[PDB]
Design an enzyme around this catalytic site. Structure first.
Site, PDB file in Angstrom:
ATOM      1  N   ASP A  58       6.757  13.610 -33.427  1.00  0.00           N
ATOM      2  CA  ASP A  58       6.236  14.583 -34.388  1.00  0.00           C
ATOM      3  C   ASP A  58       4.723  14.381 -34.407  1.00  0.00           C
ATOM      4  O   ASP A  58       4.199  13.533 -35.129  1.00  0.00           O
ATOM      5  CB  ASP A  58       6.861  14.370 -35.766  1.00  0.00           C
ATOM      6  CG  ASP A  58       6.375  15.374 -36.807  1.00  0.00           C
ATOM      7  OD1 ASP A  58       6.755  15.220 -38.000  1.00  0.00           O
ATOM      8  OD2 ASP A  58       5.607  16.302 -36.448  1.00  0.00           O
ATOM      9  N   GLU A  96     -16.965  -7.144 -25.946  1.00  0.00           N
ATOM     10  CA  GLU A  96     -16.925  -8.311 -26.813  1.00  0.00           C
ATOM     11  C   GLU A  96     -16.640  -7.732 -28.184  1.00  0.00           C
ATOM     12  O   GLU A  96     -17.458  -6.977 -28.738  1.00  0.00           O
ATOM     13  CB  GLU A  96     -18.226  -9.108 -26.841  1.00  0.00           C
ATOM     14  CG  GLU A  96     -18.787  -9.524 -25.516  1.00  0.00           C
ATOM     15  CD  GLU A  96     -20.218  -9.964 -25.664  1.00  0.00           C
ATOM     16  OE1 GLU A  96     -20.842 -10.416 -24.671  1.00  0.00           O
ATOM     17  OE2 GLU A  96     -20.720  -9.862 -26.799  1.00  0.00           O
ATOM     18  N   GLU A 126     -16.362  -8.663 -31.716  1.00  0.00           N
ATOM     19  CA  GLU A 126     -16.515  -9.509 -32.889  1.00  0.00           C
ATOM     20  C   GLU A 126     -15.577  -9.061 -34.001  1.00  0.00           C
ATOM     21  O   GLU A 126     -15.374  -7.866 -34.212  1.00  0.00           O
ATOM     22  CB  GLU A 126     -17.960  -9.480 -33.362  1.00  0.00           C
ATOM     23  CG  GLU A 126     -18.911  -9.963 -32.261  1.00  0.00           C
ATOM     24  CD  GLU A 126     -20.391  -9.849 -32.634  1.00  0.00           C
ATOM     25  OE1 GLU A 126     -21.165 -10.737 -32.175  1.00  0.00           O
ATOM     26  OE2 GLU A 126     -20.755  -8.875 -33.362  1.00  0.00           O
ATOM     27  N   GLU A 180     -18.754 -16.919 -34.516  1.00  0.00           N
ATOM     28  CA  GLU A 180     -19.951 -16.089 -34.450  1.00  0.00           C
ATOM     29  C   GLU A 180     -20.859 -16.394 -35.649  1.00  0.00           C
ATOM     30  O   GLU A 180     -20.645 -17.368 -36.383  1.00  0.00           O
ATOM     31  CB  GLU A 180     -19.542 -14.610 -34.285  1.00  0.00           C
ATOM     32  CG  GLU A 180     -20.700 -13.592 -34.110  1.00  0.00           C
ATOM     33  CD  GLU A 180     -21.684 -13.891 -32.949  1.00  0.00           C
ATOM     34  OE1 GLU A 180     -21.283 -14.145 -31.766  1.00  0.00           O
ATOM     35  OE2 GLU A 180     -22.906 -13.846 -33.257  1.00  0.00           O
ATOM     36  N   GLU A 230     -15.133 -14.202 -31.703  1.00  0.00           N
ATOM     37  CA  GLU A 230     -15.342 -13.410 -30.504  1.00  0.00           C
ATOM     38  C   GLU A 230     -14.579 -14.057 -29.371  1.00  0.00           C
ATOM     39  O   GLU A 230     -14.445 -15.283 -29.320  1.00  0.00           O
ATOM     40  CB  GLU A 230     -16.837 -13.349 -30.159  1.00  0.00           C
ATOM     41  CG  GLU A 230     -17.297 -12.213 -29.233  1.00  0.00           C
ATOM     42  CD  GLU A 230     -18.776 -12.337 -28.870  1.00  0.00           C
ATOM     43  OE1 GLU A 230     -19.592 -11.511 -29.351  1.00  0.00           O
ATOM     44  OE2 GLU A 230     -19.126 -13.287 -28.128  1.00  0.00           O
ATOM     45  N   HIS A 239     -20.068  -5.250 -28.367  1.00  0.00           N
ATOM     46  CA  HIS A 239     -21.047  -5.358 -27.306  1.00  0.00           C
ATOM     47  C   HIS A 239     -20.351  -4.918 -26.030  1.00  0.00           C
ATOM     48  O   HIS A 239     -19.416  -5.563 -25.542  1.00  0.00           O
ATOM     49  CB  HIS A 239     -21.633  -6.762 -27.221  1.00  0.00           C
ATOM     50  CG  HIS A 239     -22.338  -7.189 -28.465  1.00  0.00           C
ATOM     51  ND1 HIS A 239     -22.835  -6.288 -29.382  1.00  0.00           N
ATOM     52  CD2 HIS A 239     -22.692  -8.415 -28.913  1.00  0.00           C
ATOM     53  CE1 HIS A 239     -23.424  -6.942 -30.366  1.00  0.00           C
ATOM     54  NE2 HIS A 239     -23.358  -8.234 -30.103  1.00  0.00           N
ATOM     55  N   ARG A 281     -32.274  -9.098 -28.561  1.00  0.00           N
ATOM     56  CA  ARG A 281     -31.171  -8.689 -29.413  1.00  0.00           C
ATOM     57  C   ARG A 281     -31.612  -7.882 -30.630  1.00  0.00           C
ATOM     58  O   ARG A 281     -30.765  -7.510 -31.447  1.00  0.00           O
ATOM     59  CB  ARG A 281     -30.372  -9.917 -29.850  1.00  0.00           C
ATOM     60  CG  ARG A 281     -29.853 -10.738 -28.699  1.00  0.00           C
ATOM     61  CD  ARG A 281     -28.712 -11.574 -29.182  1.00  0.00           C
ATOM     62  NE  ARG A 281     -27.784 -11.999 -28.141  1.00  0.00           N
ATOM     63  CZ  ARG A 281     -28.065 -12.820 -27.135  1.00  0.00           C
ATOM     64  NH1 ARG A 281     -29.288 -13.320 -26.994  1.00  0.00           N
ATOM     65  NH2 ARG A 281     -27.111 -13.141 -26.257  1.00  0.00           N
ATOM     66  N   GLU A 285     -26.000  -4.078 -21.588  1.00  0.00           N
ATOM     67  CA  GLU A 285     -25.204  -4.395 -22.765  1.00  0.00           C
ATOM     68  C   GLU A 285     -25.723  -3.512 -23.888  1.00  0.00           C
ATOM     69  O   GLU A 285     -26.871  -3.651 -24.340  1.00  0.00           O
ATOM     70  CB  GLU A 285     -25.262  -5.889 -23.114  1.00  0.00           C
ATOM     71  CG  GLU A 285     -24.763  -6.224 -24.520  1.00  0.00           C
ATOM     72  CD  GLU A 285     -25.105  -7.653 -24.968  1.00  0.00           C
ATOM     73  OE1 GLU A 285     -25.994  -7.816 -25.843  1.00  0.00           O
ATOM     74  OE2 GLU A 285     -24.521  -8.613 -24.398  1.00  0.00           O
ATOM     75  N   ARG A 323     -25.571  -2.690 -27.547  1.00  0.00           N
ATOM     76  CA  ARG A 323     -25.199  -3.485 -28.704  1.00  0.00           C
ATOM     77  C   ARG A 323     -24.843  -2.641 -29.916  1.00  0.00           C
ATOM     78  O   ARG A 323     -24.138  -3.148 -30.798  1.00  0.00           O
ATOM     79  CB  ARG A 323     -26.318  -4.466 -29.080  1.00  0.00           C
ATOM     80  CG  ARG A 323     -26.634  -5.481 -28.007  1.00  0.00           C
ATOM     81  CD  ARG A 323     -27.829  -6.340 -28.401  1.00  0.00           C
ATOM     82  NE  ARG A 323     -27.632  -7.025 -29.665  1.00  0.00           N
ATOM     83  CZ  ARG A 323     -26.927  -8.136 -29.813  1.00  0.00           C
ATOM     84  NH1 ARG A 323     -26.357  -8.705 -28.764  1.00  0.00           N
ATOM     85  NH2 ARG A 323     -26.800  -8.689 -31.009  1.00  0.00           N
TER      86      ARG A 323
END
Lengths: 474, 475, 474, 160
Positions: free
Chosen positions: A53, A132, A134, A216, A223, A272, A342, A360, A362
């Protein structure tokens, strides 16, 4: 599809299987299942599909045309480690029986249509993604949604808020990571060492090769590094990863969440995301145009950054997502790239061998539908290489500097601050999604109405306890 | 402050045996602040020169290096404070900027005079009359929690549907409760605030305010008192008094009041229904025969208010909580049109609409607004309308809350802004009609912008909300 | 209307009045008020009226045309005995400003239109009504309306359910009327003697001449005999009566209700309604056709009984109303008349002098809008005399006999068992209401939609705790 | 098939519960539903209005006795409605003459008692039983639900 089916039936036979658990992802990202008693499975039942459904998922079917089909994809199936009685989980695709085509509102269908649109253009052969995720492990979560009261409280024995509490007749063991202090004190300050370690074992149990496992930065956070996979397969393992982490938290009497920002003043959870595009065994991201990357890779990035303000509607798909996009928590708010940085939206990691070259990203969080996020990013990166989009210049500063002035005077676009602006921008720039009908406009329109009502309209309309600190005395 | 008025003020004190003078002044946010002087230590000169104070403590105002400022008392509408144990007379004040030797351009009450004086100077009008209805709530309890791991609020009231089952003094529950959305206007004992509301207007008059109507309102603990129209500053002044009077009367009887726009999800918000008329030479320029008893002058005024509306929301709807109220279906405007007898519209033409009474009522403002800035800005936007002969468009005599999201966008129908962030953006991108004759100086606007982003937006955009835990926790 | 206004203003002056409390009745029957600070009253403010937001009452105005007017009727005003600061209460009429006529959905407007329609036909001059409003005084009432739980519990120190309870450190004083035993034991078994007595004093305080005051049959129940009045004035005093009883209950720390059936297995509350029609000082109900009554009176009754099944939609206007119309509690379920008979729908009382001749209709309850009930009855009694309607033969038996057989084999119509059937019947026979536009069809249609949503649709849709005793184990 | 008053708290629009008596393929607003697969070996209807408060024997027995009347008397089921049935108004209900489910068990028993012949064929439902079943359901379910106060009446009516 009957290659697999014999063998899969043979895999069930020798694992003594009593249930086959068909799992499929709605728009929201929720994993849903429906179990069939194995003995009642015929080979024909896997060509036809599983009826269900599909009117019960907002953004999909209205009741007048409720019947749909699940099409089992017989890949990455695995024995459920937790179910008391033997169960095999199988991912499934939703088949539209009114158009006799894969469901243009099936997220995992879109994810296959995108990893095919790259095959079809010739730019690349594989699109590798590496998440990754977290997450947080709390002991208790309490909520209140009502006329006169809104309320939440997570709880964790690690929290700064319990330093004075009486637990087991008034015994408190101290040793708490501070606010933002979880990276990476040894036990007993780290109380999750065996919890994280057993997660990894069960992740391997379901066909997920693992790498790293750590506490972390935030107080109850964690992580696991899982191996790059192709676009769907990457998203397939995100669904798996979350299921395992949530369920092992549950066996040990806790409760997990991958939600972006559960604690004020502490780190949010990131997804990430690591991407590279390859063709004929040569990694196309590797070059010498910039720090070990190709201009092709930088054009990809040019496209991701260009549409990012709208791309955020799929990668940052909850209002809570934007509570994380605040400076000063290793969460990007400014859309630029940088090596080993970062504070930046995108990061070029350190290694960058011609085999590991990648970006990467973020800014996504695990509140997203993994299928849509991965899909949407690739459609944004491909638009970049088509138009050979300029990603701008690198910014190798601590981006959490000169907020008000340098942003407006010199600086580049930053992430949208609310989910609503992310949707506006999305609707104002949707072509890079719509080519080759990867994202049909009815799906795009389905997602906008679903997300405004599920996420924006409640948040814009339920008062927040801080307004009572500010305004009650107005 | 002419010494004809300082003298008689001193005599008012001697024959009412006043022992403290409570100089009160409004910062930008709308908070009424005070500083009491032991009477008898008061000079004639301190009412001229002024009262020193520390203006570095008010965000949007002075830095510590130039912190000293002056309070300038205005000896109008002063009143003996009934609540203080020892006799005190409250007197209004403005901030005088001693570094620029001009009335402080960031003093909201100073803005409200500069806004009403810009009209008399332009010749368009003599007086601008404003009349606010500040709906409020009287609760029993409010409990709040802001922390790393917990956000939390709880209002509580004996009338609340959430108390239909509670055990009280000995587990006795009196029943008789208005439904969610049912407070208009059941009689007691369902109405518990009849003596509280009655005690408020007794004290409102004590402080030099005239009241006409007092009723329970639509939401469960909600109430309202109608006060006489006043000129732009004086109306905003009586709003400060009124807010104080109910808060303190709620308090003396053991309760806690609020004028905040939306404390209860799923029940009516509180409005500041603001009524305007502009008069000149004792004629009411809003009355005419262009439309339902309104003049071309008034309709151009309305067009100016409607044109700048989305940016005006930044002064009239100055908290994010304002925007939890601006949701369809609670007699709160989301659509910016006018209509007679229509409570779905942003502006409303009341039924009576005689000559002497011709007026608009703007339903979108709330009491989280600074009344000075709100009134000042509403007048500056209407005057732009008369200057530029702005057409307010066409009235919509429909149920505005029945219109679709299709019918919204397709039919190009200018709705209210959904957040304070967009409202400030809309204001900052349309700020000129306020800057006429330096009424809203740009330094102030940037201060006001900086204040509202740091006080309200950045904290609401960054503190988790409990509903995200229902939605997203399971991801 | 300026006759009164001077004098009324003079009455306020010497009663030191600070508030004038304008009171008016919505469709539901709820009394509503809005207080004006006296000093702010001009004479002109009473010609024009009081504006208000009539969109807040279901069945009245939609928001597009929200503004309405209250027209104060300066009759039966009185000083509020309870309000801390002096208040005068004034009844009001709702004026429709879009049709510039009294509001065809104003209940009290209908009640004036009906007592005029009798003037206008010549049948009668006055229509006298006399209400006995049975009520209950409980100590505590607790309710729960929710997804997983529906809950009520009244409480009274007199209830059989407290015979074993500990009150004030474990002291219980005994002396409780049994189930159905309140009529009329002396104190201390009767705990409400001073409560009922003070009610009567305040009733006189507001211009209600009183007669009898007693405990009633059920455990916490009571009644006050108030003097016949004309149709509106009778309904005006019902509004008053209820306000006083509820408020004195409240001052003494209790809580009253005139709701039809609060206790299972105990008597409900009735609005025993007494009617006579007079003309030129001669009581038209008196005659010698039957036990001291005229044939005119019996034709009236013929009409009330004829339309009764539909008339019940206004006299028994709550679903709770029908929980009372159960045999065996001095509540009528069978539509016949009889002398000195309380199992009968209608009762001819004992006295029946040519001055007191009347009927007593026992089937209405105080859940009704008094205006509509009185009005509707008269429109049903007048239809009777127009058509000289036969009321059938008297039934002088205990009607709570031979239920299943004698009802279907020989017997006459009985009261509808649910509010829904009462509305069906009402809509299927509405002309006797619609003549001379007393009950306009838009009002009749307003009341049907309002009552289905307020009363029927919630009752038909919220599960009842008894289904859990019956069906949970199904 | 809906043999308790609690059945009728379920027969309210918008919970994939039928209030409208029509058929449609892939439609969960309809009383009857034609499933998607509908092969030869699998051709079938699904009736969505029954619940487990029903006695399965009586329910199944009666469903079959009513379908067989249909084949005997070649009864046309009318026209399928491929709309969202819960979106239709109270106007669109009455004006468009659209036969809805009964709202209470009392009306359902009345409707049954006034149409009992298709069950009495070949003495399958003897009349003694029907009168027993009628007497049972009125005393067990209706008379107690019609006569025991309900807590919502306390929210509605207590303040009168």
């Amino acid at each position: 599809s009957e290659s697999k089916i014999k063998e899969f039936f043979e895999f069930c036979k020798e694992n003594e299987v009593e249930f086959v658990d068909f799992r499929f992802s709605d728009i929201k990202g929720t994993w849903n299942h429906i179990a069939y008693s194995f003995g009642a499975l015929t080979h024909g039942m896997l060509k036809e599909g599983i009826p269900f459904d599909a009117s019960c998922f907002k953004g999909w079917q209205g009741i007048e045309h409720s019947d749909m089909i699940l099409t089992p994809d017989l890949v990455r199936y695995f024995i459920d480690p937790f179910s008391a009685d033997v169960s095999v989980v199988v991912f499934c695709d939703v088949y539209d029986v009114y158009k006799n085509q894969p469901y243009e509102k099936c997220p995992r269908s879109i994810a296959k249509k995108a990893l095919q649109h790259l095959k079809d253009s010739g730019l690349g052969d594989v699109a590798y993604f590496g998440a990754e995720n977290e997450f947080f492990i709390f002991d208790s979560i309490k909520i209140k949604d009502a006329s006169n009261s809104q309320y939440y409280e997570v709880d964790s024995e690690e929290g700064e808020w319990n330093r004075d509490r009486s637990f087991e007749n008034g015994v408190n063991f101290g040793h708490r990571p501070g606010k933002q202090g979880g990276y990476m004190p040894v036990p007993p300050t780290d109380t999750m060492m065996d919890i994280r370690t057993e997660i990894v074992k069960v992740l391997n149990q379901v066909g997920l090769e693992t790498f790293v496992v750590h506490h972390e930065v935030a107080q109850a956070q964690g992580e696991v590094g899982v191996k790059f996979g192709d676009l769907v397969e990457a998203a397939d393992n995100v669904q798996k990863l979350k299921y395992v982490v949530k369920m092992v938290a549950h066996l040990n009497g806790k409760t997990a969440t991958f939600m972006p920002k559960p604690l004020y003043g502490d780190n949010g959870s990131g997804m990430h995301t690591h991407v590279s595009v390859w063709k004929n065994n040569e990694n196309l991201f590797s070059g010498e145009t910039y720090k070990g990357l190709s201009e092709f890779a930088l054009h990809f990035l040019g496209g991701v950054l260009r549409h990012a303000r709208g791309l955020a509607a799929f990668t940052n798909a909850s209002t809570n997502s934007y509570k994380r996009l605040i400076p000063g928590y290793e969460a990007p708010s400014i859309l630029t790239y940088s090596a080993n940085n970062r504070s930046a939206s995108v990061r070029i990691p350190y290694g960058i061998s011609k085999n590991s070259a990648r970006f990467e990203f973020r800014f996504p969080d695990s509140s997203s539908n993994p299928y849509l996020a991965f899909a949407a990013i690739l459609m944004a990166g491909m638009d970049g290489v088509k138009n050979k989009i300029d990603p701008g210049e690198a910014m190798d500063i601590n981006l959490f500097k000169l907020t008000l002035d340098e942003i407006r005077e010199k600086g580049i676009k930053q992430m949208p601050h609310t989910l609503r602006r992310s949707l506006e921008e999305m609707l104002a720039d949707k072509q890079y999604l719509k080519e080759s009908q990867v994202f049909s406009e009815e799906f795009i329109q389905a997602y906008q109405s679903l997300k405004f009502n599920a996420e924006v309209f409640p948040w814009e309309s339920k008062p927040h306890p801080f307004e009572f600190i500010t305004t009650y005395s107005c």
